[PDB]
Amino acid sequence: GTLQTILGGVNKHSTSIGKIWLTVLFIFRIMILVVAAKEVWGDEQADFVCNTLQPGCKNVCYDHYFPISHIRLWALQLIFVSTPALLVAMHVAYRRHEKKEGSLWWTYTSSIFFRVIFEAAFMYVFYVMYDGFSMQRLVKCNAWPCPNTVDCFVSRPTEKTVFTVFMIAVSGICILLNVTELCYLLIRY
Amino acid sequence: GTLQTILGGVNKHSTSIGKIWLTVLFIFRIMILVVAAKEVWGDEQADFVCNTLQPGCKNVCYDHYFPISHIRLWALQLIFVSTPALLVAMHVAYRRHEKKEGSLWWTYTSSIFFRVIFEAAFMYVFYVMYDGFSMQRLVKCNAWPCPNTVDCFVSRPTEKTVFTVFMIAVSGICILLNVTELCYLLIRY
Amino acid sequence: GTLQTILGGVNKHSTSIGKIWLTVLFIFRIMILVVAAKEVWGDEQADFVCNTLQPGCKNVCYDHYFPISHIRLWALQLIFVSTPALLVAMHVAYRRHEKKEGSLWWTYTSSIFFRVIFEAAFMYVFYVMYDGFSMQRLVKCNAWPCPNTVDCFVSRPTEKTVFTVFMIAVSGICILLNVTELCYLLIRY
Amino acid sequence: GTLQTILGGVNKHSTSIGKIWLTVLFIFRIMILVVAAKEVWGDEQADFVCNTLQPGCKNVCYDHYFPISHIRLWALQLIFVSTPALLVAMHVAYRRHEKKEGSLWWTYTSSIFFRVIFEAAFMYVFYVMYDGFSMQRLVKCNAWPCPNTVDCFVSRPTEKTVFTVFMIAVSGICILLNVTELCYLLIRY
Amino acid sequence: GTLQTILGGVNKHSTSIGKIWLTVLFIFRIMILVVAAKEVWGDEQADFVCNTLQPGCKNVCYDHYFPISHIRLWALQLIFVSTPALLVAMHVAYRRHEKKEGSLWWTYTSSIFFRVIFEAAFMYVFYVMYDGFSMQRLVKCNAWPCPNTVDCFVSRPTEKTVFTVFMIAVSGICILLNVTELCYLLIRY
Amino acid sequence: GTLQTILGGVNKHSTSIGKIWLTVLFIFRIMILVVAAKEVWGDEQADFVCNTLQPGCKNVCYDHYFPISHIRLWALQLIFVSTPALLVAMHVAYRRHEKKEGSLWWTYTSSIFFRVIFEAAFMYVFYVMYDGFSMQRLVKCNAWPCPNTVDCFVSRPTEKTVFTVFMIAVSGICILLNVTELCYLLIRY
């Protein structure tokens, strides 16, 4: 509800690319995460099935191959890339209150520099942690107390792959948009 | 709550067909998806039953025949066909802010051109992926590790067929309405 | 929340019967569906029990006797009978905006004509599909793959019957109120 | 949210007893039903246990002894006793709109007459249907297909009894308050 | 949402202790009950485990030792201690409306007298019903149909004890604050 | 919704560090707890698995090693560290109402002194209760009625460790920010 009012405040005090394309893509990712993707991961552990009679083997194998869920990583990423925009708004509101270019410049050019770092950091984590963007149907697990190697089966691997590729692609576009914003301000000096 | 306020803003700045019929049908599809259809697909995997003792065969057979759920496809389709309208609103708000036909024409005629493409694209995906709009009671699955061929049974196939035909028919009507909007602007030049 | 504001807008621009009795009964049906009836049908398939060892027989028997749930039919009916009122509101708002009897007459008399058709259509569907308004405790099912004939037992048949009779009776009253509205406008010509 | 605004409108246009005590007790019953009582009846059928191996005996015994749940009866009762107050508000709003004692008297004295009837009707139903206000731990069921007589056990019988006595007592107080309101208007003539 | 607006209205028309400390502690208890304590009691019966093969013994033993849940008692207590404040607000609003010390005194001094009674009554009930504020891991049950004496095990006894002590301590503080409010008005006469 | 309005009121009447960094980190912790961390702990007891046939051993072992859940501790911590800010707001509103440095100084310097105490207290509790910030896959339990020593396995130990380190680190930063706020006011005297 009030989030729409927040967007209008953040909509102002930005450049053409920043006003429209960055904000639309940011809302785009939130909608995908909230209304569509969150129920795909609902039964991630409930429907995780292992071919064994060993008690506790299912708990350790799921924890080994999914140290942190994909949706939790995306939730953290959206929070981190949204804070520098929120910090600017409070700084401007604080600045206006005390009133009744250089300071504005350095705050703005720093905020879009942190967003690029955060986007690239989480994008790198997704790759190393899950060795690619495709989820497998079968995982082989040999952690204690599983005897030898145990076959375990993931829930909805194909649908999770579709949303993973979707979220990564949009994040890559947001990186390019922020990079161009730097170039526009770089040549203007 | 605030979504109603959003509709009023989008209600304005449109033509007779665009103001009323496109917006009503768009709200029509959202209501069907939210209040009625979403709980039909709630137990899609929980009540998926296969006649086998092989561990993991249920996971791979459901994933094979339902790579992405119908409700997730409709959620993606509604988001895509709604973005060009949202892009116009921010462009107009940006245009009005800087103020204090050709630009308006090209943005408007392009937005309704993207909606036709997105509607047809998702409509085509529904056909090829699910080979028609009727869901079967029985699916035969022979993917590893299922031994030979295994019979599996879908949950609520008839009710899902009813809502599938309903959503496809409304999407087809929206395509025709957008096509006529092009014709009205085509003859006017 | 905002739905209350919507009602006030729809409350105006109507006749004495239309202003009060039709709108109150419409809110009456929504309240019954939302706060009371929706949790009666919550375990419709989970608590559906069949006396058999055949895998998949439960899925096909429930689908055979309940092609579409009662609550989904009522949700569709309320949406259909509410659209003509919503179409009038946008037409009036569009008409007022362009400003700054015959047109108003034909739109109004048509809207209450569609409501009668939609109410009677869904009322007819409830009868033919479920052969009466009483739900049985026992259903006998012989669809493949059930061997011979299998006894299956419905969940909460009596409570569902009570709400079915309640919703049908209110719909019948709404039909009569709309018919009288036609008679008042018929004699006035 | 907006319900609080609704109360303020209904708070006005009433007498001293009607303004305060009837409205407070009405909010009192809603709070008990919503925040406290509704989760007591959550597992009414899930935790209903019968001592038998007969398939379907649990479904028919629960349906026999609980034709309609207590919380659904209270939800219906609150809706019925609230409509005459809502009808008056629309009548007054309609009356004021056309402007820009006898009519007001008959509408008001009729509304509080319907509330007494509805309160007594539902109170009578609670008694005959459930033969008293105390819920038993054990119910004996001999309906088909249960063999002979089967023992079944109710979930949370004591807590449900506490809330049943609570709701009945408050309803009895509301009857007395409405009766006195008639007496005050009866002597005044 | 609107509850915050309600607090502002109740915040005014009170004394220094009443304006701040009573209202803060009242909000304090609601937050504990809503956001923290309510999910502790979620599986109170689902995870209640008894060492027996007797059908129905689990139902009767849980009902015997938990006639009413702790969270339901706290929900009732908060509603009761909040009504006298709500009654004053409607009385003042009614008084102001008819306008366009003694009456105000007696209403105010009575309201804080009922709050002390309600706080002490529920505090006494918690003690006698549950014989102290510590919940045990093991309960021994011999009610029919349990054979002899059966061992049953409570879910999350330690966490429930922590929140029980927390709620009792805050209630005790609220009693003292109300008592001092009487003393301040007693000496002033 | 209204929480955003609350933040704006709390945003004012603070110092540079207090206005921005403390409030942003406070919102930061709430977002992590609400949208991300709360569903990690959803199946804490449901997926807790012990290698035994002893009834009731699972209940006592979970209760022994998790006397209070991590998310409940964080919920309590956020409530405690937020009350002194809320107390100041009501004091200022009360002060302004009666109007129509020393008092303001002592209230402000005390509020940030309580926040440091509460942050350190809960941080200490997390350490002693859970002997570090890393959660183990395996816990060995010998409480009655478990025979000898029983192996039990925790659900999602790695993901819970990640969020535990995250919440502790942010709390440590908030302690440092409050300490510096004291130093700024200490030198100014």
Residue numbers in the entry:
A (entry chain C), B (entry chain D), C (entry chain E), D (entry chain F), E (entry chain A), F (entry chain B): 4 to 103, 129 to 217
The authors write:
Connexins form large-pore channels that function either as dodecameric gap junctions or hexameric hemichannels to allow the regulated movement of small molecules and ions across cell membranes. The hemichannel is composed of 6 connexin subunits arranged around a central funnel. Each subunit consists of 4 transmembrane helices (TM1–4), an N-terminal helix, which lines the funnel entrance, a cytoplasmic loop, two extracellular loops, and a short C-terminal tail. Here, we use cryoelectron microscopy (cryo-EM) to determine the structure of human Cx26 gap junctions under increasing levels of PCO2.
